[PDB]
Amino acid sequence: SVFSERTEESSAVQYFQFYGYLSQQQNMMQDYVRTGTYQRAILQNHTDFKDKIVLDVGCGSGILSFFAAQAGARKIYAVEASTMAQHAEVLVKSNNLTDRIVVIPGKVEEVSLPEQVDIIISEPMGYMLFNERMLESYLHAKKYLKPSGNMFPTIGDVHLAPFTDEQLYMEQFTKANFWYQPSFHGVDLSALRGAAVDEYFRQPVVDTFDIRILMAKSVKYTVNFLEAKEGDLHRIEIPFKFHMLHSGLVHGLAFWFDVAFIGSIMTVWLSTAPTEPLTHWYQVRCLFQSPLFAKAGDTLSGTCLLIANKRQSYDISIVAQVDQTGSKSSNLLDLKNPFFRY
Amino acid sequence: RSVFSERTEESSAVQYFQFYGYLSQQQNMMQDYVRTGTYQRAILQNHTDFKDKIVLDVGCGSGILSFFAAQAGARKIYAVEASTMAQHAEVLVKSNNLTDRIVVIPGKVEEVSLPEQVDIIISEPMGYMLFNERMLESYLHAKKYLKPSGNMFPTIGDVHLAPFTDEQLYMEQFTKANFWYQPSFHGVDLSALRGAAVDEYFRQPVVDTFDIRILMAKSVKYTVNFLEAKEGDLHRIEIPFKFHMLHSGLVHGLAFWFDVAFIGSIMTVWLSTAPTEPLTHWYQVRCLFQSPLFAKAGDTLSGTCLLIANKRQSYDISIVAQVDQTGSKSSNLLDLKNPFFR
Amino acid sequence: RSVFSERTEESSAVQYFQFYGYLSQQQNMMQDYVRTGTYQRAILQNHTDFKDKIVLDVGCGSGILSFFAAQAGARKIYAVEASTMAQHAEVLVKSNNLTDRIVVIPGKVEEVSLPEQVDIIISEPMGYMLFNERMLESYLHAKKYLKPSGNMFPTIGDVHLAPFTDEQLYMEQFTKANFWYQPSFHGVDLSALRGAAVDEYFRQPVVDTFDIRILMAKSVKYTVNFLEAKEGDLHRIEIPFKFHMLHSGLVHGLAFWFDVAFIGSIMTVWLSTAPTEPLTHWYQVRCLFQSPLFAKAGDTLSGTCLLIANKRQSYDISIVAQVDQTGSKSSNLLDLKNPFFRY
Amino acid sequence: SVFSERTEESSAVQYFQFYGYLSQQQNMMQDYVRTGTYQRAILQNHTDFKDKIVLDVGCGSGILSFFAAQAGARKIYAVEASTMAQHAEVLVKSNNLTDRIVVIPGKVEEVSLPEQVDIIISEPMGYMLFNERMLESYLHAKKYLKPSGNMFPTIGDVHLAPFTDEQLYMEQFTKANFWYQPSFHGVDLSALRGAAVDEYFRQPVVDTFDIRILMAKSVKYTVNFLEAKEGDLHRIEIPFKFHMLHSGLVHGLAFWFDVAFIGSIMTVWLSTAPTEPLTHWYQVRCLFQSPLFAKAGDTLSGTCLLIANKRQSYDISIVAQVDQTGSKSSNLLDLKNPFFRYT
Ligand SMILES: COC(=O)c1cc(O)c2cc(NC(=O)NCCCCNC(=N)NC/C=C/[C@H]3O[C@@H](n4cnc5c(N)ncnc54)[C@H](O)[C@@H]3O)ccc2c1
Ligand SMILES: COC(=O)c1cc(O)c2cc(NC(=O)NCCCCNC(=N)NC/C=C/[C@H]3O[C@@H](n4cnc5c(N)ncnc54)[C@H](O)[C@@H]3O)ccc2c1
Ligand SMILES: COC(=O)c1cc(O)c2cc(NC(=O)NCCCCNC(=N)NC/C=C/[C@H]3O[C@@H](n4cnc5c(N)ncnc54)[C@H](O)[C@@H]3O)ccc2c1
Ligand SMILES: COC(=O)c1cc(O)c2cc(NC(=O)NCCCCNC(=N)NC/C=C/[C@H]3O[C@@H](n4cnc5c(N)ncnc54)[C@H](O)[C@@H]3O)ccc2c1
């Protein structure tokens, strides 16, 4: 299948094992911004659901399918590949909805659906939007979507902005300097210090921060889920030209995302921005190896290149320069192995 | 088709060795002064066990124990390591001018070939609750390279189990599970999953430390003598216990810690992870009962702790316990692979 | 087959009047200075409502309110009491040389005969949560003896409801019920009864006091006007509510208190059992939800509190509540007759 | 029936309602002395149960029946009159014992059993042993007992001893003196002071005490359950002659009880004595209206007369004198209305 071809088995096993835990479902469900917004998006756009056929991609415990049911869906196919599928079945029976919600265990790339659907619902967003590569499963599911069918969410906006955080930058060196000692219990560890620094710099930092560290208005990269193909997410090139609002050292780029549910009655937004209440997605920061000095009114230009890998994540390549001085910085980061700093 | 590969799922092995490939994890272990200092003291104070001897270091990581063996006058030390840390160990051996004495051999100790038999094996094979990671088996497997009358460091391991009362720990885990009691979470009845949620939460061993005043009886000790034991002995570990209750109250579960002893020619040195001793990176481990047992001071609490090895480099733990005077019984099944770090 | 006997099981009536027969219980009530002092102030400061008037004292107990009516210049006071306390009231009337003004009439006010109509009725008919004991109906029944211009003291009653958060109260009741979770209590599996145990514990309204900082929204008020109401109005009491949440958190249930007003010709005097006011022997009452509802500040929590009168001189309480924004719902059934005294 | 003839309906309703609550079962079950001793008595005398037919009188949740089952009983009839019967049925099913434990709802005086039993088990003891008059239901149940048959418990011993407790005595007057005031909000209450004192003195005091208040070795009254007839408990006369071990004022008599399970293998005792760990039976003290002065070596003689009433309790008459001085005291107490003093 399409899933198996783009995914290493060792990664898939661990991934679905993780999503098998009720504790993880509870964690997601307790995020009121997440759960409450999905409910509002679905219920306030009830005419998009009333007597319609629905597909729920990666349904977990089934919450979104129950929201679809509350909004009057005739039939809902809830697909889930983890062992959570069996717990969803239990809930469907206990809530007397066996006639309306049909749980289908398996990958959405592998299962068969009996009929085409009017609307697809899912929560395919990982850290930095793209992590987990579930957006591709969501897009793959459009083979089951009728012409003029809708998708919830309809679009996703990834936001990038440059930040200054001297303490975050310096912390990498302080940690690595453990190895810069000539007699640790009689052993000279200094030769490994450079390797430790490299290791810490490969890790994107998952944490939140005060918005006062942001040095320019964000640049937005939009994926329209109605129009996009799976293929569009294998190589994601995000050019940026930031107009600097403050002078100082730029230590890296900060990432967050919004999604929009574009219904017939209204558009509802779910934001993970640092200006908004914290979600279980937090925000993500990728450091530069060396900070770039910019003055207010300079432009900081470059590219963020995300290359999909077989571990259900991305290799991140960031190149940036201050156009006025020609000072340049790169970094290469492994999105699969983030540092949780919070 | 090696012994390691036969008892280990590939997905588990990949993740395991990836984890131990990170310098940050080496640093974490090395910064435990009780662990690093005690290993150094054990080796150096028993220098005649090392002077002009051949040594095998099983799972050497960064190589620290091999450097200690060298400081104590070892003629030759084979340092085996299966993670990518092997390459960093090589770097340190060169940078410390010890290429004549320390030979790094990358690979699993079950798979590599050594040119000669050794006088002594050194390792840190202990995981959480001693047994986790199933590295004790690799350590014992390595005895095929040990000369007759060869020694092992550590020489023996003692696991200790004792009943505890901790209402706050119990209520915390119970309170989390009770999230799934709600009849109307955004209009959805979750209560059918409540039993399954409780099972999941109570299946997790709790890794943290505690005041010794929670212990309700003198510990029971199970000893593994590394000189005598075979790999096979660790596939199924049955630990009988009969506790003489020193205090009345609710027993919420069993607490576990371990000591190891380095039995040298000059002296015996102990490394203890007991709650009476300074904290180590092993902490201590508590297995909760789903329902606490009431006992009076002077009652006996008897039963069995059964550890069954699995292919994820850990153990399924079965605990059966009863208050003999009343016949109040509790049985519980825990997944040592998925601990809760408090 | 009086009105009292028809609405009341004999076993409940026996126990009820036996309880109110004890001097120790009278002392308990009389020692509440807020209660005794406020009744005295209401009566004495409205002396022209009593001066040379005929008075009925419904459920007079030891007779204290009748003595207050006498101090305020009443010509004649009929003091009705169904418990054996009637005989102790007679003793006090003689010992205080008021035999010419206070006439004790033993029996239920639904059963006795009074020789004439009265200008004003006085009583303390309020139980826990106002309605408990169903004495408000005896008080209203007594209006058959009231002249057209006639007044009532108290004149009106306001019941207040507000949502509260109290994790410790919730966990306490839950922790007690969880005794019945054990799979091996001396070798016996009790877990099949766990649901029934929880129902039983959560069916009990909690009588005690609390800090007002647990209240999560402004109270909703339900008013009974004693001058206008009929006995029948109290058989089924429906209290709708729509709370505008002032704080985010888990709502563990609803808190209840009441005020009564003595609306006299000279002034109105209030007796409040609110948690903002000094403690009375009525305390306050909390009905827990079996499962708490999460609300955010600015949500609305709407539903109904339905009180259905029973033959045990109390009410079956039905509470249905939902957070409108999420549709999270809780319904609960409580036995007001069997409260848990937590103080 | 025999139960209905000796019991007022209003008393029976309230009584069985009380025992219907899981909270009350839990209270009793959590008494480790009670539950643990019953289990030990049954299990350590397993040959009295192995393949035998058993009757469990007033089984409540069924715990004693489950102990009988653990000891190898072939069949157990568990009789219970409260709504707890239905909860017991649930536990029998949940513990897969429907083939061995048969719950029979109703009064043991009214139900039918299909066959005679080898042994009766029960917990018929109330406060001071006799309260609740359940001992009579237990004895009544012997109509179902085979000739060889045993009873668990087999015998009950009530203990009486004189005590000195000045603070307990004085406390009655301090409480009553609330009424000894000439102007309580303008009302002279003093006429009721004597009546308040009388009321407090009619109540037996349920709490525990240090054994150092006891002024003489206890006197024992034994009921042998194998031999006694229901009738024997309608009028219980307990003569006493105490040989005073200490000088001082005797303020009343203290009561506790032991029961013995006399099995084939061993005798097991359950004691509620003040020398033993506290149980949910506590101990009971009946005050004298006036204390008696005695010197060490004097004899304090008299009678405790318990007269059964239709409220499932006893009217207690206590008469005592110091033989050397002829100083005499009486008291009359209502066992149905005890004062729970324990804090
Ligand atoms: C190498 O090791 C590491 O370095 C590692 C290892 C780890 O495990 C780590 C875990 C971390 N945890 C963490 O904080 N994550 C944040 C998540 C927040 C946002 N959550 C989501 N909304 N998730 C998306 C929803 C998914 C659902 O859809 C189902 N589904 C997926 N695909 C299919 C398909 N094809 N067909 C059918 N159903 C499918 C799936 O099963 C779920 O139910 C952090 C770091 C780690 C590092
Ligand atoms: C939420 O996420 C989870 O679910 C999760 C779950 C978890 O359990 C987690 C556990 C955590 N930490 C942890 O465990 N701390 C206690 C251990 C401290 C001390 N460790 C040891 N001394 N271990 C043994 C030494 C091994 C060395 O030997 C090498 N080696 C092994 N085998 C062989 C072989 N056959 N041949 C050759 N070399 C071999 C290996 O590469 C190493 O260098 C942290 C996070 C977790 C998260
Ligand atoms: C077993 O444990 C339980 O289950 C339980 C359950 C409980 O509820 C418990 C309640 C407790 N205490 C309590 O409630 N405290 C504060 C609230 C009381 C505030 N006092 C009042 N104002 N009440 C109303 C006034 C009545 C007077 O009027 C007389 N009267 C009534 N009706 C008529 C009639 N038709 N005709 C003529 N006279 C009548 C009556 O005889 C009195 O003299 C304590 C323990 C409990 C235990
Ligand atoms: C309003 O406040 C008050 O005025 C008040 C006044 C009070 O006195 C209070 C007393 C309190 N506590 C108390 O008493 N503690 C001492 C007793 C502890 C040990 N109890 C027993 N073992 N009881 C004997 C066994 C009974 C079981 O046998 C069943 N059963 C009985 N007869 C029959 C029959 N004929 N047929 C079939 N089944 C029958 C019955 O249903 C039960 O399951 C608490 C509160 C109070 C409040």
XYZ file of all heavy atoms in Angstrom, chain C residues 15 19, chain D residues 3 6 14-16 18-20 24-25 28 34 57-61 79-84 104 106-110 122-127 131-134 137-138 206 280-282 312 335-338 340, ligand 4:
495
model
N -42.173 9.846 64.084
C -40.764 10.185 64.266
C -40.546 11.696 64.294
O -39.832 12.210 65.156
C -39.924 9.529 63.155
C -38.441 9.869 63.096
C -37.792 9.415 61.776
O -38.359 9.589 60.681
N -36.587 8.843 61.875
N -39.233 13.910 67.497
C -37.996 14.689 67.421
C -38.197 16.084 68.005
O -37.380 16.546 68.809
C -37.493 14.759 65.971
C -36.316 15.676 65.754
C -35.023 15.237 66.006
C -36.504 16.956 65.245
C -33.939 16.068 65.776
C -35.425 17.796 65.003
C -34.139 17.353 65.264
N -43.420 -11.060 65.167
C -42.725 -9.777 65.051
C -43.704 -8.617 65.089
O -43.491 -7.627 65.799
C -41.893 -9.677 63.758
C -41.179 -8.358 63.614
C -39.908 -8.180 64.152
C -41.803 -7.274 63.000
C -39.264 -6.957 64.050
C -41.160 -6.051 62.899
C -39.890 -5.893 63.425
N -45.381 -7.731 68.604
C -44.496 -7.124 69.639
C -43.891 -5.802 69.142
O -43.077 -5.224 69.890
C -43.392 -8.106 70.054
C -42.304 -8.349 69.011
C -41.191 -9.187 69.622
N -40.158 -9.632 68.690
C -39.187 -8.866 68.192
N -39.117 -7.573 68.488
N -38.295 -9.400 67.374
N -39.078 2.692 60.285
C -37.850 3.436 60.517
C -36.644 2.504 60.669
O -35.582 2.740 60.072
C -37.961 4.382 61.724
C -36.695 5.146 62.100
C -36.750 5.817 63.467
O -36.050 6.802 63.772
N -37.584 5.258 64.317
N -36.815 1.440 61.465
C -35.757 0.445 61.772
C -35.217 -0.171 60.467
O -33.989 -0.141 60.237
C -36.304 -0.621 62.721
C -35.322 -1.697 63.096
C -34.392 -1.500 64.103
C -35.319 -2.916 62.441
C -33.484 -2.490 64.453
C -34.411 -3.913 62.769
C -33.490 -3.700 63.779
O -32.601 -4.683 64.111
N -36.100 -0.731 59.636
C -35.653 -1.426 58.424
C -35.134 -0.459 57.348
O -34.198 -0.786 56.624
C -36.728 -2.395 57.919
C -36.926 -3.579 58.838
C -38.144 -3.817 59.450
C -35.873 -4.435 59.111
C -38.300 -4.899 60.307
C -36.013 -5.510 59.959
C -37.228 -5.751 60.562
N -33.410 2.212 58.128
C -32.054 2.484 58.595
C -31.081 1.414 58.089
O -30.007 1.736 57.568
C -32.022 2.599 60.120
C -30.641 2.724 60.708
C -30.001 3.948 60.767
C -30.004 1.607 61.252
C -28.734 4.054 61.322
C -28.747 1.703 61.812
C -28.109 2.928 61.854
N -31.473 0.143 58.207
C -30.617 -1.015 57.838
C -30.627 -1.263 56.316
O -29.869 -2.158 55.865
C -31.020 -2.242 58.651
C -30.400 -2.261 60.022
C -31.178 -2.152 61.164
C -29.025 -2.370 60.175
C -30.606 -2.156 62.427
C -28.436 -2.383 61.431
C -29.235 -2.279 62.565
O -28.673 -2.306 63.809
N -31.414 -0.490 55.557
C -31.414 -0.551 54.108
C -30.224 0.111 53.418
O -29.968 -0.147 52.251
N -24.512 2.083 56.177
C -24.608 1.402 57.461
C -23.934 0.027 57.437
O -23.275 -0.359 58.403
C -26.073 1.278 57.901
C -26.284 0.515 59.209
C -25.464 1.054 60.366
O -25.216 2.249 60.468
N -25.033 0.165 61.240
N -24.119 -0.718 56.340
C -23.414 -1.988 56.147
C -21.901 -1.787 56.176
O -21.168 -2.519 56.837
C -23.796 -2.648 54.817
C -25.130 -3.369 54.802
C -25.238 -4.431 55.892
O -26.122 -4.339 56.741
N -24.347 -5.425 55.889
N -20.515 -1.207 59.659
C -20.398 -2.447 60.403
C -19.241 -3.300 59.879
O -18.474 -3.836 60.658
C -21.737 -3.200 60.379
C -22.895 -2.422 61.030
S -24.490 -3.284 61.088
C -24.894 -3.465 59.371
N -15.241 -6.868 64.862
C -16.541 -7.518 64.548
C -16.363 -8.493 63.375
O -16.603 -9.705 63.549
C -17.578 -6.427 64.261
C -18.915 -6.946 63.769
C -19.032 -6.899 62.265
N -20.424 -6.821 61.880
C -20.894 -6.917 60.646
N -20.076 -7.075 59.615
N -22.198 -6.844 60.445
N -29.537 -15.270 60.103
C -30.663 -14.436 60.509
C -30.244 -12.971 60.490
O -29.363 -12.570 61.240
C -31.177 -14.813 61.916
C -32.423 -14.004 62.266
C -31.460 -16.304 62.002
N -30.893 -12.182 59.625
C -30.582 -10.776 59.448
C -29.228 -10.584 58.798
O -28.361 -9.916 59.354
N -29.073 -11.152 57.596
C -27.774 -11.295 56.925
C -27.174 -10.002 56.379
O -25.977 -9.963 56.063
C -27.877 -12.300 55.769
S -28.916 -11.716 54.418
N -28.008 -8.963 56.238
C -27.581 -7.708 55.681
C -27.029 -7.944 54.285
O -27.706 -8.548 53.458
N -25.796 -7.484 54.044
C -25.112 -7.613 52.756
C -24.734 -9.059 52.437
O -24.472 -9.390 51.293
C -23.855 -6.734 52.722
O -22.897 -7.173 53.677
N -31.602 -14.806 55.571
C -32.854 -14.074 55.747
C -32.569 -12.627 56.113
O -31.731 -12.352 56.996
C -33.721 -14.727 56.837
C -35.039 -13.970 56.999
C -33.958 -16.195 56.509
N -33.260 -11.703 55.432
C -33.104 -10.272 55.686
C -34.375 -9.514 55.292
O -34.929 -9.731 54.218
C -31.875 -9.731 54.949
C -31.701 -8.212 55.010
C -31.594 -7.691 56.440
O -30.747 -8.219 57.211
O -32.358 -6.757 56.787
N -34.826 -8.626 56.187
C -36.125 -7.970 56.079
C -36.047 -6.594 55.439
O -37.038 -6.104 54.900
C -36.780 -7.878 57.455
N -34.866 -5.971 55.511
C -34.634 -4.668 54.896
C -34.420 -4.853 53.397
O -34.224 -5.978 52.931
C -33.406 -3.986 55.509
O -32.200 -4.531 55.002
N -34.420 -3.732 52.666
C -34.143 -3.716 51.234
C -32.703 -4.159 50.892
O -32.402 -4.418 49.735
C -34.437 -2.332 50.626
O -33.689 -1.333 51.328
C -35.908 -2.019 50.715
N -31.839 -4.263 51.911
C -30.511 -4.858 51.769
C -30.541 -6.283 51.196
O -29.563 -6.750 50.629
C -29.793 -4.864 53.118
C -28.293 -5.145 53.044
S -27.321 -4.051 51.991
C -27.922 -2.468 52.570
N -33.438 -15.017 51.228
C -34.880 -15.060 51.453
C -35.289 -13.722 52.063
O -34.995 -13.455 53.224
C -35.268 -16.241 52.360
C -34.898 -17.555 51.672
C -36.760 -16.220 52.653
C -35.054 -18.778 52.543
N -37.522 -10.956 53.882
C -38.602 -10.941 54.854
C -38.109 -11.080 56.279
O -36.902 -11.274 56.525
N -39.053 -10.995 57.223
C -38.774 -11.219 58.634
C -38.662 -12.710 58.864
O -39.442 -13.479 58.318
C -39.884 -10.632 59.515
C -39.906 -9.114 59.605
C -40.909 -8.480 58.662
C -40.991 -6.988 58.893
N -41.610 -6.295 57.721
N -37.692 -13.118 59.684
C -37.479 -14.527 60.007
C -38.682 -15.147 60.731
O -38.834 -16.370 60.727
C -36.190 -14.739 60.824
C -36.316 -14.156 62.208
C -35.834 -16.215 60.922
N -39.523 -14.296 61.342
C -40.779 -14.721 61.969
C -41.894 -15.029 60.962
O -42.902 -15.616 61.333
C -41.292 -13.661 62.964
C -40.400 -13.438 64.187
C -39.308 -12.396 63.954
O -39.094 -11.988 62.789
O -38.662 -11.984 64.921
N -41.704 -14.613 59.700
C -42.744 -14.653 58.667
C -42.422 -15.539 57.458
O -43.319 -16.129 56.867
C -43.066 -13.228 58.203
C -43.789 -12.411 59.273
C -43.909 -10.928 58.955
O -43.699 -10.524 57.793
O -44.242 -10.160 59.885
N -25.812 -15.369 63.233
C -26.412 -14.045 63.253
C -25.540 -13.070 64.003
O -24.659 -13.477 64.765
C -27.787 -14.079 63.942
O -28.448 -12.818 63.847
N -25.823 -11.781 63.806
C -25.306 -10.718 64.646
C -26.514 -9.992 65.220
O -26.872 -8.917 64.755
C -24.417 -9.749 63.874
C -23.812 -8.688 64.774
C -22.919 -7.723 64.020
O -23.424 -6.850 63.282
O -21.702 -7.851 64.177
N -27.190 -10.574 66.229
C -28.393 -9.977 66.802
C -28.170 -8.934 67.914
O -29.152 -8.382 68.367
C -29.093 -11.207 67.386
C -27.949 -12.087 67.859
C -26.844 -11.863 66.853
N -26.913 -8.668 68.292
C -26.573 -7.771 69.387
C -26.743 -6.282 69.030
O -26.170 -5.801 68.046
C -25.125 -8.013 69.828
C -24.769 -9.470 70.146
S -24.142 -10.387 68.707
C -22.459 -9.798 68.574
N -27.520 -5.555 69.849
C -27.596 -4.103 69.780
C -26.768 -3.497 70.903
O -26.068 -4.207 71.644
N -26.842 -2.171 71.044
C -26.266 -1.453 72.210
C -26.695 -2.180 73.483
O -27.880 -2.580 73.570
C -26.754 -0.006 72.272
C -26.211 0.884 71.191
C -27.015 1.822 70.577
C -24.879 0.817 70.810
C -26.508 2.681 69.610
C -24.358 1.653 69.834
C -25.176 2.598 69.235
O -24.670 3.428 68.276
N -30.763 -4.021 73.066
C -31.433 -3.055 72.207
C -31.694 -3.626 70.810
O -30.906 -4.422 70.309
C -30.625 -1.768 72.089
C -31.394 -0.674 71.402
O -32.539 -0.408 71.742
N -30.780 -0.058 70.415
N -32.812 -3.189 70.215
C -33.341 -3.628 68.915
C -34.251 -4.861 69.015
O -35.017 -5.144 68.085
C -32.236 -3.852 67.874
C -31.369 -2.612 67.644
C -30.373 -2.778 66.504
O -30.642 -3.554 65.544
O -29.323 -2.123 66.576
N -34.154 -5.588 70.139
C -34.932 -6.820 70.425
C -34.728 -7.839 69.298
O -35.668 -8.603 69.008
C -36.418 -6.484 70.596
C -36.725 -5.652 71.832
C -38.218 -5.477 72.016
N -38.871 -6.725 72.393
C -40.173 -6.856 72.634
N -40.986 -5.819 72.503
N -40.660 -8.030 72.983
N -33.538 -7.877 68.701
C -33.276 -8.845 67.658
C -32.893 -10.200 68.255
O -33.015 -11.224 67.584
C -32.207 -8.359 66.675
C -32.288 -9.156 65.374
S -30.906 -8.828 64.310
C -31.114 -10.226 63.188
N -35.723 -12.494 67.699
C -35.814 -13.026 66.329
C -34.843 -14.192 66.168
O -35.172 -15.201 65.569
C -35.520 -11.945 65.284
O -36.379 -10.833 65.413
N -33.652 -14.049 66.748
C -32.581 -15.075 66.745
C -33.080 -16.334 67.455
O -32.880 -17.434 66.926
C -31.322 -14.509 67.406
C -30.097 -15.388 67.364
C -29.654 -15.974 66.186
C -29.342 -15.588 68.505
C -28.504 -16.751 66.153
C -28.195 -16.362 68.488
C -27.768 -16.940 67.307
O -26.633 -17.693 67.304
N -24.019 6.615 75.238
C -23.201 5.726 74.407
C -21.910 6.447 74.049
O -21.927 7.447 73.330
C -23.933 5.298 73.130
C -23.039 4.431 72.274
C -25.206 4.557 73.491
N -18.122 -0.844 67.244
C -19.224 0.059 66.919
C -20.395 -0.056 67.943
O -21.386 0.681 67.858
C -19.684 -0.120 65.454
C -20.363 -1.430 65.162
N -19.828 -2.653 65.510
C -21.520 -1.704 64.509
C -20.641 -3.620 65.112
N -21.675 -3.071 64.504
N -20.255 -0.976 68.908
C -21.169 -1.089 70.059
C -20.784 -0.176 71.228
O -21.578 0.051 72.134
C -21.235 -2.527 70.565
C -21.984 -3.462 69.653
C -23.336 -3.543 69.493
C -21.417 -4.461 68.812
N -23.650 -4.529 68.593
C -22.489 -5.108 68.156
C -20.106 -4.876 68.544
C -22.290 -6.140 67.244
C -19.910 -5.914 67.641
C -20.993 -6.531 66.999
N -19.557 0.352 71.195
C -18.985 1.219 72.259
C -19.240 0.560 73.621
O -19.002 -0.672 73.762
C -19.556 2.638 72.146
C -19.327 3.282 70.804
C -20.226 3.092 69.766
C -18.190 4.037 70.555
C -19.994 3.631 68.507
C -17.966 4.618 69.317
C -18.864 4.406 68.285
O -18.643 4.968 67.061
N -39.086 -1.733 69.857
C -37.917 -2.579 69.613
C -36.772 -2.240 70.542
O -35.613 -2.335 70.174
C -37.463 -2.458 68.150
C -38.576 -2.743 67.159
C -38.136 -2.593 65.733
O -38.371 -1.562 65.107
N -37.497 -3.627 65.200
N -33.933 3.236 76.613
C -32.875 2.680 75.770
C -33.023 3.003 74.280
O -32.039 3.057 73.573
C -32.733 1.170 75.969
C -31.521 0.520 75.281
C -30.222 1.238 75.643
C -31.426 -0.953 75.637
N -34.257 3.245 73.826
C -34.526 3.604 72.428
C -33.918 4.934 71.992
O -33.640 5.119 70.817
C -36.034 3.644 72.176
C -36.452 3.911 70.724
C -35.860 2.920 69.732
C -36.372 3.217 68.325
N -37.102 2.059 67.779
N -33.730 5.858 72.943
C -33.263 7.217 72.664
C -31.932 7.519 73.350
O -31.861 8.346 74.258
C -34.339 8.212 73.113
C -33.927 9.659 72.911
O -33.321 10.006 71.903
N -34.265 10.514 73.875
N -30.822 6.863 72.941
C -29.538 7.056 73.614
C -28.899 8.394 73.231
O -29.270 8.947 72.207
C -28.707 5.865 73.128
C -29.269 5.547 71.760
C -30.738 5.897 71.833
N -25.491 9.883 72.077
C -24.196 9.542 71.505
C -23.280 10.705 71.824
O -23.420 11.780 71.280
C -24.315 9.301 69.994
C -23.068 8.723 69.362
C -22.756 7.362 69.488
C -22.206 9.534 68.621
C -21.610 6.845 68.908
C -21.065 9.012 68.037
C -20.770 7.669 68.183
C -32.545 9.776 64.603
O -31.490 9.294 65.470
C -31.840 8.351 66.346
O -32.807 8.437 67.061
C -30.904 7.191 66.339
C -31.164 6.134 67.213
C -30.336 5.040 67.248
O -30.549 3.985 68.083
C -29.195 4.954 66.399
C -28.313 3.845 66.400
C -27.218 3.801 65.563
N -26.338 2.690 65.565
C -26.487 1.518 66.266
O -27.580 1.041 66.566
N -25.320 0.919 66.598
C -25.267 -0.324 67.357
C -25.632 -1.543 66.527
C -24.446 -2.118 65.780
C -24.643 -3.540 65.300
N -25.931 -3.720 64.654
C -26.522 -4.922 64.529
N -25.843 -6.021 64.387
N -27.875 -4.965 64.547
C -28.646 -6.196 64.634
C -28.787 -6.808 63.275
C -29.525 -6.310 62.311
C -29.690 -6.903 60.974
O -30.701 -7.930 61.029
C -31.851 -7.513 60.315
N -33.039 -7.920 61.060
C -33.450 -7.449 62.280
N -34.570 -7.977 62.709
C -34.922 -8.863 61.703
C -36.010 -9.742 61.551
N -36.987 -9.882 62.454
N -36.062 -10.487 60.424
C -35.084 -10.359 59.522
N -34.014 -9.561 59.557
C -33.986 -8.838 60.680
C -31.699 -6.004 60.130
O -32.457 -5.500 59.031
C -30.189 -5.918 59.909
O -29.774 -6.319 58.605
C -26.971 4.870 64.698
C -27.799 5.956 64.663
C -28.932 6.033 65.508
C -29.811 7.142 65.502
